[PDB]
Amino acid sequence: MKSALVVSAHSADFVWRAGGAIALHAEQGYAMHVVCLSFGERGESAKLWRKGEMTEAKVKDARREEAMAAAEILGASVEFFDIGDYPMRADKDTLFRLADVYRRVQPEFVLSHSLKDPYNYDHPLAMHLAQEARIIAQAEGYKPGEKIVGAPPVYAFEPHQPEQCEWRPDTFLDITSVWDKKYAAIQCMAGQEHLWEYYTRVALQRGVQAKRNVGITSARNIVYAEGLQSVFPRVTENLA
């Protein structure tokens, strides 16, 4: 089956930043798989920590259930490496774990975080894991005999503060046809209504910009979009 991979540093990230891309490609017949490296239990769970008698285990449970609910709505499978956030740290074993996901999923493309992020050190680490694991999975000397990975395009989805991250979308994905799914997944992020609104505005802004880049008087109905920054040059037979 056609497949693709999302590598999310914290469990909520794939929902804010990749929900549209996931739902859209699922409807195109893709087996979308999400790896959440951590749950954002320490640094992306303020509401929970403000309740009494909170624990990391309790936070992880709440985050896990939200992610599974969102994944179901979007049409993706999801797994949890649970390696911890703030700080997130990985070793060779994390890397090989992720390379094995690549070997199993054989994704056509990969979505992860920007390589710079002055607001969150965990985010670029996730993308570095995603990229290096991809290359390990290409090596005929890694678990010899296994089917190797090819060269799936890798993209950074939109960070919270794109210019501060030196991130530029060179690719707009029109997610207008699946906005309802992305927003329903967004609503699984309990207690984070301000972010619901923020990422709604993001999709609308990128929607207008995407429309501008196909011609402002075009009849195409581009209302919601996700911006992506490509890691690799694309290969094509047509320049339109």
Q: Six-digit token pair at 88?
A: 């997130």
Asked if 209 interacts with a copy of itself (CB under 8 A), we say: yes
Q: Six-digit token pair at 119?
A: 């607001």
As beta bridge partners, residue 229 has: 156
13 binds, among a copy of itself, Zn ion, none (CB under 5 to 8 A by kind): Zn ion
Helix/strand/coil for 193: helix
Which residue of 7, 35, 59, 74 would you call a contact of a copy of itself, by CB under 8 A? 59
Helix/strand/coil for 66: helix
61 is in an annotated binding site: no
As beta bridge partners, residue 156 has: 112, 229
Q: Which residue, among 98, 103, 69, 101, has the nearest Cα to 83 in the 3D structure?
A: 98
The least distance separating a copy of itself from the CB of residue 216, rounded to whole angstroms, comes to 8
Asked if 216 interacts with a copy of itself (CB under 8 A), we say: yes
13 is in an annotated binding site: yes
Which residue of 10, 97, 181, 182 would you call a contact of Zn ion, by CB under 5 A? 10
Asked if 77 interacts with a copy of itself (CB under 8 A), we say: no
Q: Quick one: 105 or 210, whose CB is closer to a copy of itself? A: 210
Selected range binding Zn ion among 7-15, 72-80, 162-170, 192-200, rule: CB under 5 A: 7-15
Task: Give the other-Cβ count within 10 Å of 163's Cβ.
Answer: 8
Which residue of 5, 21, 186, 189 would you call a contact of a copy of itself, by CB under 8 A? 21
Q: Six-digit token pair at 236?
A: 């094509």
Q: Six-digit token pair at 182?
A: 């992305």
CA distance 85 to 219: 45
123 is in an annotated binding site: yes
Asked if 57 interacts with a copy of itself (CB under 8 A), we say: no
114-134: b (≥16 Cβ within 10 Å) or e = bbebeebebbbbbbebbbebb
Asked if 29 interacts with a copy of itself (CB under 8 A), we say: no
- Segment 212-231, which members bind Zn ion (CB under 5 A)? none
The least distance separating Zn ion from the CB of residue 156, rounded to whole angstroms, comes to 13
Q: How far is the CA of 21 from the CAs of 110, 171, 194, 204, in angstroms?
A: 11, 12, 22, 15
Asked if 183 interacts with a copy of itself (CB under 8 A), we say: no
- Segment 119-158, which members bind a copy of itself (CB under 8 A)? 119-121, 131-132, 135-136, 138-142, 144, 148, 150-153, 155
* Footprint of Zn ion (CB under 5 A): 9-10, 13
